[PDB]
């Protein structure tokens, strides 16, 4: 059967970037040209591989990570980037094999007066390692005195909501992002091209 990309790409709601979702894709035929030929994606950039070669390759499994960020942050979903998303939310490795796919989701994820459902992590003492995921919510100690779980001065909740309103400039509008990565083990290959 064809790989169920629609479950990922056409999901009703996406994950917040700090709690980004990973879906394993196995035991199916993947026609990657249905994706890269599409006029719907404003970003489709592959690293370590060419998109027109994907259909010729067999993998043990394929993985789809998905989340929502602001338009101006899509450039951080790339090897070697820095910033709040790359540093504290979703980190690709410096040498990456995979594809980054993104599209404007203003019509789905913004709301008159504001959609605040989507969050990102603002405060974190150190950068994420590649493919690390941090969903902790400890009060962030920004001063010399410990917080003991109490918000207050210099003691901050680490997550912050995006403010997605339809009148936002494009760089402040929500973008849905799918990162495809590929896995090759000494195991049967279960996702092949057509």
């Amino acid at each position, epitope marked *: 059967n064809l790989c169920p990309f629609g479950e990922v790409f056409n999901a009703t709601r996406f994950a917040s970037v700090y709690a980004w979702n990973r879906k394993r894709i196995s035991n199916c035929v993947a026609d990657y040209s249905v994706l890269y030929n599409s006029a719907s994606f404003s970003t489709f950039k592959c690293y370590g591989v060419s998109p027109t070669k994907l259909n010729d390759l067999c993998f043990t499994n394929v993985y789809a990570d998905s989340f929502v960020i602001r338009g101006d942050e899509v450039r951080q979903i790339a090897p070697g980037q*820095t*910033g*709040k998303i790359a*540093d*504290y939310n979703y980190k690709l490795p410096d040498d990456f094999t995979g594809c980054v796919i993104a599209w404007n989701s203003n019509n789905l994820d913004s709301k008159v007066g*504001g959609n605040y459902n989507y969050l990102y992590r*603002l*405060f*974190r*003492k*150190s*950068n994420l390692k590649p493919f690390e995921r941090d969903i902790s919510t400890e009060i*962030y*100690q*920004a*001063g*010399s*005195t410990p917080c003991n779980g109490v918000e207050g001065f*210099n003691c*901050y909740f680490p997550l*912050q909501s995006y*403010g*997605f*309103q339809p*009148t*936002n*400039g*494009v*760089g*402040y509008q929500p973008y849905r992002v799918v990162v495809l990565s590929f896995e090759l083990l000494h195991a049967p290959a279960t996702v092949c091209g057509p």
Partner: single-chain antibody, 225 residues
Framework: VQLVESGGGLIQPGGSLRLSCAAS????????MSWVRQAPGKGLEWVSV???????FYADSVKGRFTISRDNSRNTLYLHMKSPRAEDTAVYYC????????????WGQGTLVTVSSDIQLTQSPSFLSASVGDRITITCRAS??????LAWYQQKPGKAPKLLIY???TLQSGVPSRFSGSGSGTEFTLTISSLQPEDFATYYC???????????FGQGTKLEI
């Protein structure tokens, strides 16, 4: 509780300079820490920021010439000015950024450095003369919708800017209630309901954004008697 700059001075070109900013109670390495500068008679310019995790970002006017760093054991932020030019002459403020990692709630007193020889924000009016008790409005307009990512500052002569309002309408703790902010998207207004004599100052709006860009601050409004 405080940020204290040092290391400024008057230098001839062709050298190097290092500013330092020693913090208390604020922990430098846990915060979005920045340098903001102000040339004599001009507006504010965000120069560089150092993230808690160590990423650094610089305005295009100083990229390649300035470096920001920190010493965790001395709880100190530094600005290393390599090849300083006359156009770097300014008062240099150390700041901590809180809301969205770009709203500056604490400022050092600033240190003077003299060197011998994309969304745009428009603030109106540039000059505003009024009397005590007047109701005054200052408006900030952005070239694209920026939701509520805006803050307002008051700068008295000789002093560091002071945060009044952030998230467009949220009044900073300790600011009198006659100050209020309104608007969203592309138009934001600072209202002072009943002008008092201590309110005569220069006011700045700021598009609250994660990186030091050239249009971070409005050009300012000089409020005069």
């Amino acid at each position: 509780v405080q940020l204290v700059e040092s290391g400024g001075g008057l230098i001839q070109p062709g050298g190097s300079l290092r500013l330092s900013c020693a913090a208390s109670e604020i922990i430098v390495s846990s915060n979005y820490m920045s340098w903001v500068r102000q040339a004599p008679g001009k507006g504010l310019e965000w120069v560089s920021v150092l993230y808690p995790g160590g990423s650094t970002f610089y305005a295009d006017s100083v990229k390649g010439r300035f470096t920001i760093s920190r010493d965790n054991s001395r709880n100190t932020l530094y600005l290393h000015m390599k090849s300083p030019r006359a156009e770097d002459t300014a008062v240099y403020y150390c700041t901590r950024a809180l809301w969205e990692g770009a709203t500056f709630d604490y400022w050092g007193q600033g240190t003077l450095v003299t060197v011998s020889s994309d969304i745009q924000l428009t603030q109106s009016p540039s000059f505003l003369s009024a009397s005590v008790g007047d109701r005054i409005t200052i408006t900030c307009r952005a070239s694209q919708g920026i939701s509520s990512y805006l803050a307002w500052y008051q700068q008295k002569p000789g002093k560091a800017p002071k945060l009044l309002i952030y998230a467009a309408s949220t009044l900073q703790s300790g600011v009198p209630s006659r100050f209020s902010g309104s608007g969203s998207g592309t138009e934001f207004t600072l209202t002072i309901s009943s002008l008092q004599p201590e309110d005569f100052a220069t006011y700045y709006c700021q598009h609250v954004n994660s990186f030091p860009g050239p249009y971070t601050f409005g050009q300012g409004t000089k409020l005069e008697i």
